[PDB]
Amino acid sequence: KVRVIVDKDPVATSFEKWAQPGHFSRTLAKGPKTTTWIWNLHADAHDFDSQTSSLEDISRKIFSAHFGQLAIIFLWVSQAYFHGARFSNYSAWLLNPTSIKPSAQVVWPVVGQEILNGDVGGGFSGVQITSGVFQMWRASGITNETELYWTAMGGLMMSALMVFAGWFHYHKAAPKLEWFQNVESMMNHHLAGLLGLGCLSWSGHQIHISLPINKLLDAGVAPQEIPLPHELLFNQDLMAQLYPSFKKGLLPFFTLNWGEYSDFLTFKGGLNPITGSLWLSDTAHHHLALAVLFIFAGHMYRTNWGIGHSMKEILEAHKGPLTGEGHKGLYEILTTSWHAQLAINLAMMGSLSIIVAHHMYAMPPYPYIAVDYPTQLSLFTHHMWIGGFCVCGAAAHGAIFMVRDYSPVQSYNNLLDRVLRHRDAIISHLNWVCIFLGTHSFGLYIHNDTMRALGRPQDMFSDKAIQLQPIFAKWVQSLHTLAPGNTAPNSLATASYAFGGDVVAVNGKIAMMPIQLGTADFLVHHIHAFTIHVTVLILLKGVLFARSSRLIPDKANLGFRFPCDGPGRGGTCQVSAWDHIFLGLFWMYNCISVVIFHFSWKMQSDVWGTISEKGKITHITGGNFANSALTINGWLRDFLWSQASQVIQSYGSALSAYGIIFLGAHFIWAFSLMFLFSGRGYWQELIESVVWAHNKLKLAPAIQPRALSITQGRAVGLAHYLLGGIGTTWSFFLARIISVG
Amino acid sequence: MSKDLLKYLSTAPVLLTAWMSLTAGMIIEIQRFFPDSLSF
Amino acid sequence: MTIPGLNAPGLVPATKKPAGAKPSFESYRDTSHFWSSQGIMDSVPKV
Amino acid sequence: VVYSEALPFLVRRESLGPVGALVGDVGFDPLGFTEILPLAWLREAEIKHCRTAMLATFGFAFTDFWHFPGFDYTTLEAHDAVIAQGGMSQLLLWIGLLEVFSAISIDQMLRGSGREPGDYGFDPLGFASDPAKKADLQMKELANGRLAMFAFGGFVTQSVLTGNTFPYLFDYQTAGDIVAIAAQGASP
Amino acid sequence: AISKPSNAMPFLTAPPCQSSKLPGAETGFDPLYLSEFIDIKWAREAELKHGRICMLATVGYIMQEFFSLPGYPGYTPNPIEAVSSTPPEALAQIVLVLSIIEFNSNKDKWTMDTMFTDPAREPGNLGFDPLKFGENKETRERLAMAELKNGRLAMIAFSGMIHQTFVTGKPLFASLNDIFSSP
Amino acid sequence: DVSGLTPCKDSAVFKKRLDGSVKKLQARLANYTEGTPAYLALEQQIDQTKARFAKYGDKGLLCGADGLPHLIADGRPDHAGEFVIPAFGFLYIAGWIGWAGRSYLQFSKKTDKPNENEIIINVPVALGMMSGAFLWPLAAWKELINGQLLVPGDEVTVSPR
């Protein structure tokens, strides 16, 4: 049966193993003899399966670690709400959202940093924020600072409860592996219980507190006069005054006259003209429908009662001629190995973050967020980066599963075996695809540069010399534009105005606009595809060739991350799947960097801007994307050089912090190249010279210093490279968008 | 505050963070009380 | 200063109002330190 | 089978300990906090809350009548007024010194020094020096303090709700007839 | 039910200082138990040094308000302002003389490991006893305990005078009169 | 005075820089109303700016044609406060630091578990070493004379030439 079964008091509570630093691993528990011990203590900190063999113990450690992480996240939600409560201008922004710059952080006057408390409107001096939390709270219906303070206190209480839960579920009552492996009940409760009831509760909150407050705010009622949420929750007369369908009660729900709730449950679509964002009635209907969908989906898998599915049987039933045994063994793999689950979950989380980035900008969900140009850019770019990082984590943990938890006795003649048996074909064909795609997509840019420099615009791959029109994307956009009448008759507007339709604008600034697709869009989209394909090549090759290869038949024996297998065979450098991830992180970094550059330039040139009373559409850069994005010279001039002005000229102003971070991120990006290009042998010899200098003075340490390991040097170089590049883009985008928008 | 927790607080990273915290606070307070000292 | 007992009375009688109607809930909630905006802004340390 | 003497329909828990190790054990623990927290810590918290509530209710009632010449504030606004003046900073400083020493004692007691839950040894006048009276006086302390918590809560809440000084009673309760028998109307 | 409680605090365990032969060791006042971490002999040396310095300093503070060196430059009854008012060379010479005294008295004994290596070295016994009060061993315990207690009271008292003058801006007894003046 | 620079107190460009910063602050002051925390903070900040400029003028710093203070580091005692006195202060502090580290290492090497003492610092004696390193110039000289500072090289690991 599916049952609760836990062991009591499995681990005592004591600081003795806090004092003992390297207790978790057998080798580290001995104590230090070189400084590599210190690094390995951090490297192997959360490698539970290397520490303990018991899957039960690994699961318990993971469960309590999840609790600790949730405590951290609750403290983070608390910081956001509390800073909005105290050190902010949320009330001023709520009164006047368009002119007030949102700010929820204040520096102290010590060393001249007080200038960073710039003019953000509302009689408030502080650092402008770009996280969209102000718009989030306006959507939620928060109109006072006491609400922010009290939800911050609640978040702190939840963080304390989560720390307590993490301690309790490891030191007092830890579950068993039998409890952990109840995947069917876990799926049922996560679908119906977590997602379904979360959506249902949020739909109720929206219907009862967000629709009335936001409708009154859009009407013009100032926040002081707004009736409080507790009054709105039970005052059915006021809710009938606002939405007439509420006077009918819940009888139109229990009887299936659901059409009576059409006023506050809508399928309007488009964007609200007042706030320039999605209709909150639409969002409430959305969350209600999703609650129903998830509760329906969560009753699929078997439990104590006879009804339900078995994922084992579902997988085993799917086997084809070209797949042999098919999905046999995958249920056991995913029930026994945590790394496989981590790989799948990280992949889907990253793809979801990217999909979130794509959806939020095209369909602004929060009020006055579309006009808040820094918020849109910041959220899109952030979620893109998080998505790429999660995808590479997925690849890494797939490789870890392959190295450690793979077994042919289990996975004989199944899909995993059949994939490993033609990995060579897979990687060779992806290699050809990568070469072809990169050659075409980048050589079109290079051709454009060559012909422009040769003074031959008639020979360009431009919109007027040799057109490469995205006919299929244009067709899909046309279908979406015509959808509200023909293929979605109950929809009163298009899902997103990017496909087509009217120009939504709040005050002078433009919320959303149709985004045209031409030759430059074709080129940059194929560039995106090329970058994604090369990243997939690197990561998939690392995962497939983690067990072994033609170069190293016994690569699994060496481990997951190892420096090499010597200079033999002409050199076996970075053969490890870890090193494959190390290289794929550079490539997802390049991919996401080009994606965010495309987003920034396209939205600045074609979407964001201002519209006058007559209708004079004036964009930030002036539509230069369509004619300058055809060349790498144009990318270097009209995007990087042109928009770096607001960063470099920021000294002596509130964005001077962005200027400093621009320089510092540049410095760290360059500092990374030392680790990336150099090698441990030189550094160990230099440390030997320095150690002689210290020993001459009788102060050479007992913990002998050593150059960093090879894998560690690669990791440090990659981390510094990513930090420097991402910080450079962060400062550049934030300074540019805050200055111009 | 058993001997084990005192030992843990005596560990190298905790001590580094504590001492550099005190040092940074000392420098910042000296800046507040004697600000803009581009000289002696 | 007023040393209590030496150059002044000791315990001094307090000023009081002789009964009164119930203050409205919004009268003291709007001034409370935790359920008022200005109350929250004033419920901070000082130095 | 031992049933809790305060809730005879529930079995004693277990973490409450032997029946009677703590003065006042009437087995009142429906929510089972003793499983999560240690009983010594909980009892130290209990006696701290008891003593603080006693002093708080007595101080509230006293300040409703009498105040020192310098402090011309009512009991409700005394907190804000004396924070502005600076006295509450002094109280926080000194009570914090005392509380740091107290916390050191709780740490030692939990780690196994031997100190009882709330035995600070404060006994100048010699009350309870005889062991025969000590358990009875502990029980009386607990009873009085547990009463004093509700006393102080009622004090503050009724004070703010009514706006009256000592009794914390509405104007109709104080002036009108709370023992009337002739038919009442709509309002008090 | 503490087996070996602190004498000063029966609700805390005995610190290492309580089970020691120092003067005033029969008090056991160490809630933070800094005697366990700090060498007790070094700590007593520092205690007596601070007490001696501050019990000079309190008398200097109270009598500088009233009395002046005749025609001394930069006098002010408020000693806080008088430090800046007075010549810097006076304070420089004073600090130099005290540096000479400390250096010569603690020659080769400036550190925890270096000092108290010799067993005969006692905390605070820098050999300063011209009048030879210590030859009379009957009163030595009285005088040692009295030195310790008066030094402690003087450290506290000097802190009081310093911070009271910071609060008021007036010298010590002027502020005291202002406190004990008419409403 | 020297290098063609002029004292900052009699520097027209320095005065204009002060005036320009003051005008910038007063210009941004227009957004906030009288008595608000932002207004009072800006008033404090402008007072600080004026005090800083007056202090630089009084200290005797030399201002160039750009109108910024230029520090003369050549060893002349007229400009000792620019480098020489801060240099001595840092040298004393850094010597204190290195002597504390070295002396604690000498203690730890004789401990039964020097490798574990390297990570877990014996704080009671570490504080003693840090305090005792205040007199490092005499202690280092004493160790030099006694020959216990520089190990003979015939006793240090050296790579095959």
Ligand code: CLA
């Ligand atoms: C989980 C989500 C959720 C929640 C919590 C609620 C809650 C509510 N909805 Mg519903 N509602 C939801 C989703 C939700 N809705 C959705 C998705 C829709 C769209 C289909 C609707 C559509 C809808 C309509 C159209 C209406 C409501 C209404 C109500 C109220 C029903 C009262 C009731 O049935 O009492 C259930 C009672 C019991 C189970 C018995 C126990 C009673 C307890 C002990 C009483 C406690 C009272 C409280 C603590 C003190 C109040 C004191 C007062 C002086 C302030 C309540 C505020 C009505 C309303 O009031 O609208 C404003 C109403 O007309 N809802």
Ligand code: CLA
């Ligand atoms: C759900 C998310 C998740 C989870 C649960 C895990 C879990 C794990 N990963 Mg990780 N991993 C993730 C995401 C995740 N990963 C992602 C997104 C990536 C892609 C980059 C990776 C890539 C990855 C690799 C390549 C490896 C692991 C490994 C591991 C294991 C040990 C990690 C450890 O002990 O680190 C302890 C923690 C640290 C060492 C600290 C890391 C600090 C980073 C590098 C820098 C932080 C910078 C900071 C944010 C900004 C600084 C600002 C500056 C101004 C100061 C563990 C099972 C290892 C493993 O399984 O080996 C067998 C392993 O080799 N992971």
Ligand code: CLA
């Ligand atoms: C601008 C820098 C740069 C360039 C040009 C390349 C090029 C390449 N990388 Mg990448 N790479 C880079 C930086 C770069 N990398 C960095 C910094 C790293 C370290 C993290 C890596 C790490 C890395 C890995 C690990 C992998 C790649 C892969 C590839 C190949 C992708 C296939 C492709 O599109 O080829 C086509 C060639 C181009 C796009 C270059 C321009 C071509 C045009 C058409 C010019 C043609 C000129 C003419 C015909 C010949 C010369 C004329 C005359 C002089 C005779 C290709 C060789 C992947 C691979 O193997 O792919 C199959 C792969 O696995 N790279």
Ligand code: CLA
């Ligand atoms: C214990 C302290 C200590 C001491 C006395 C020295 C002494 C020396 N180091 Mg340094 N060094 C130290 C720690 C120390 N090092 C550490 C921790 C590292 C690793 C980052 C280095 C890395 C290093 C390099 C790479 C080089 C030197 C060099 C030198 C020489 C020139 C001085 C200099 O420029 O320092 C430079 C100082 C640093 C780079 C940073 C020092 C780190 C901190 C600030 C000090 C450590 C204090 C420690 C925490 C004290 C604990 C004691 C406490 C518990 C009581 C000299 C022999 C140079 C040389 O060979 O010249 C001939 C040289 O090339 N050192």
Ligand SMILES: CC1=C(C#C/C(C)=C/C=C/C(C)=C/C=C/C=C(C)/C=C/C=C(C)/C=C/[C@@]23O[C@]2(C)C[C@@H](O)CC3(C)C)C(C)(C)C[C@H](O)C1
């Ligand atoms: C017992 C106990 C605990 C407790 C407790 C508690 C809550 C204790 C509370 C004690 C309390 C409440 C003690 C007030 C004293 C007030 C004094 C001395 C006032 C001085 C006032 C002075 C010196 C002057 C006042 C002035 O008006 C004068 C006269 C002149 C005017 O010009 C202005 C000024 C301002 C100058 C622990 C530690 C929490 C846990 C443990 O387990 C059990």
Ligand SMILES: CC1=C(C#C/C(C)=C/C=C/C(C)=C/C=C/C=C(C)/C=C/C=C(C)/C=C/[C@@]23O[C@]2(C)C[C@@H](O)CC3(C)C)C(C)(C)C[C@H](O)C1
């Ligand atoms: C135990 C012992 C001995 C002893 C002893 C004794 C008598 C010890 C005495 C210790 C003593 C008497 C210690 C006082 C501390 C006072 C403090 C910290 C005050 C802070 C005050 C502050 C921070 C004030 C702040 C404010 O004013 C500001 C700045 C502005 C206002 O707006 C607000 C307020 C008012 C808040 C012997 C007998 C000597 C020897 C024996 O062997 C051992």
Ligand code: SF4
């Ligand atoms: S440099 Fe690194 S990867 Fe290359 S042979 Fe040497 S150890 Fe292997």
